[PDB]
Design an enzyme around this catalytic site. Sequence first.
Site, PDB file in Angstrom:
ATOM      1  N   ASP A  15       0.805  -1.253   0.000  1.00  0.00           N
ATOM      2  CA  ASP A  15       0.000   0.000   0.000  1.00  0.00           C
ATOM      3  C   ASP A  15       0.827   1.288   0.000  1.00  0.00           C
ATOM      4  O   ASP A  15       0.294   2.353   0.270  1.00  0.00           O
ATOM      5  CB  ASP A  15      -1.050   0.012   1.139  1.00  0.00           C
ATOM      6  CG  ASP A  15      -0.430  -0.158   2.530  1.00  0.00           C
ATOM      7  OD1 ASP A  15       0.789   0.033   2.666  1.00  0.00           O
ATOM      8  OD2 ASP A  15      -1.180  -0.495   3.482  1.00  0.00           O
ATOM      9  N   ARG A  29       0.902   6.766   0.119  1.00  0.00           N
ATOM     10  CA  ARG A  29       0.189   5.732   0.878  1.00  0.00           C
ATOM     11  C   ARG A  29      -1.205   5.699   0.269  1.00  0.00           C
ATOM     12  O   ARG A  29      -1.853   6.756   0.154  1.00  0.00           O
ATOM     13  CB  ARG A  29       0.118   6.120   2.371  1.00  0.00           C
ATOM     14  CG  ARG A  29      -0.795   5.232   3.246  1.00  0.00           C
ATOM     15  CD  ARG A  29      -0.263   3.809   3.417  1.00  0.00           C
ATOM     16  NE  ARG A  29      -0.947   3.009   4.454  1.00  0.00           N
ATOM     17  CZ  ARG A  29      -2.106   2.365   4.283  1.00  0.00           C
ATOM     18  NH1 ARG A  29      -2.782   2.434   3.109  1.00  0.00           N
ATOM     19  NH2 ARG A  29      -2.630   1.686   5.294  1.00  0.00           N
ATOM     20  N   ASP A  34      -5.740  -1.272   3.630  1.00  0.00           N
ATOM     21  CA  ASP A  34      -4.669  -1.765   4.479  1.00  0.00           C
ATOM     22  C   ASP A  34      -4.215  -3.112   3.971  1.00  0.00           C
ATOM     23  O   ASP A  34      -4.975  -4.077   4.010  1.00  0.00           O
ATOM     24  CB  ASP A  34      -5.123  -1.879   5.928  1.00  0.00           C
ATOM     25  CG  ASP A  34      -3.928  -1.991   6.901  1.00  0.00           C
ATOM     26  OD1 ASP A  34      -2.800  -1.608   6.539  1.00  0.00           O
ATOM     27  OD2 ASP A  34      -4.141  -2.435   8.028  1.00  0.00           O
ATOM     28  N   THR A  35      -3.001  -3.163   3.464  1.00  0.00           N
ATOM     29  CA  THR A  35      -2.371  -4.456   3.117  1.00  0.00           C
ATOM     30  C   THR A  35      -1.644  -4.941   4.353  1.00  0.00           C
ATOM     31  O   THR A  35      -1.266  -4.119   5.181  1.00  0.00           O
ATOM     32  CB  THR A  35      -1.394  -4.323   1.918  1.00  0.00           C
ATOM     33  OG1 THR A  35      -0.463  -3.259   2.146  1.00  0.00           O
ATOM     34  CG2 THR A  35      -2.148  -4.062   0.610  1.00  0.00           C
ATOM     35  N   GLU A  37       1.620  -6.135   6.439  1.00  0.00           N
ATOM     36  CA  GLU A  37       3.059  -5.844   6.342  1.00  0.00           C
ATOM     37  C   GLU A  37       3.738  -7.025   5.668  1.00  0.00           C
ATOM     38  O   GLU A  37       3.220  -8.157   5.725  1.00  0.00           O
ATOM     39  CB  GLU A  37       3.683  -5.576   7.721  1.00  0.00           C
ATOM     40  CG  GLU A  37       3.056  -4.425   8.520  1.00  0.00           C
ATOM     41  CD  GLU A  37       3.141  -3.079   7.815  1.00  0.00           C
ATOM     42  OE1 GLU A  37       4.233  -2.745   7.318  1.00  0.00           O
ATOM     43  OE2 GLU A  37       2.107  -2.358   7.754  1.00  0.00           O
ATOM     44  N   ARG A  75       3.680  11.343   4.027  1.00  0.00           N
ATOM     45  CA  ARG A  75       3.303  10.537   2.857  1.00  0.00           C
ATOM     46  C   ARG A  75       2.110  11.179   2.115  1.00  0.00           C
ATOM     47  O   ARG A  75       1.170  11.653   2.758  1.00  0.00           O
ATOM     48  CB  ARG A  75       2.983   9.106   3.287  1.00  0.00           C
ATOM     49  CG  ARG A  75       4.149   8.342   3.923  1.00  0.00           C
ATOM     50  CD  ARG A  75       3.756   6.909   4.295  1.00  0.00           C
ATOM     51  NE  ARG A  75       2.584   6.889   5.186  1.00  0.00           N
ATOM     52  CZ  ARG A  75       2.075   5.808   5.764  1.00  0.00           C
ATOM     53  NH1 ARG A  75       2.608   4.609   5.563  1.00  0.00           N
ATOM     54  NH2 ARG A  75       0.997   5.914   6.533  1.00  0.00           N
TER      55      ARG A  75
END
Length: 129
Positions: A15, A29, A34-35, A37, A75
């Site tokens: 992401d 971002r 939400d991917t 980690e 970001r």
Amino acid sequence: LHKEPATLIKAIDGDTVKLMYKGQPMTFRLLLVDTPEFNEKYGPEASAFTKKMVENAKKIEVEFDKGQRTDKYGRGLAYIYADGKMVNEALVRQGLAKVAYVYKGNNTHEDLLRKAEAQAKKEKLNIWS
Ligand SMILES: Cc1cn([C@H]2C[C@H](OP(=O)(O)O)[C@@H](COP(=O)(O)O)O2)c(=O)[nH]c1=O
Ligand SMILES: [Ca+2]
């Protein structure tokens, strides 16, 4: 909303992507997703998916929403398009990201990504399996 040109500097993870925007390097971002980690389950798959998508694209575009364009970490906050296809949406459709971080004023594509999540869910894809 409107699409603006940008160039790939480097894949980062599921992401986050480093892009040249208005002649300056910036970490973007992805809005609304939400991917996992890299170190979590489906993390390498999410990173690989985003990597292929932005690397194979002829044209990368950035689309800011109506609210904040930068986060507390500096970001960029954007929907990212690869040859007209939205990366944020594709990750969710593939069950490689969850809809997440939905804040008022920066939620134009919420319903669209929630549709995609519902289909990944019904198909029990990756994160939903
Ligand atoms: C997606 C997104 C994240 N963020 C911030 C919230 C989280 O910070 P805090 O945890 O410090 O509150 C962090 C999550 O990003 P990552 O998922 O990249 O870790 O990024 C925003 O502020 N706005 C956004 O639209
Ligand atoms: Ca993440």
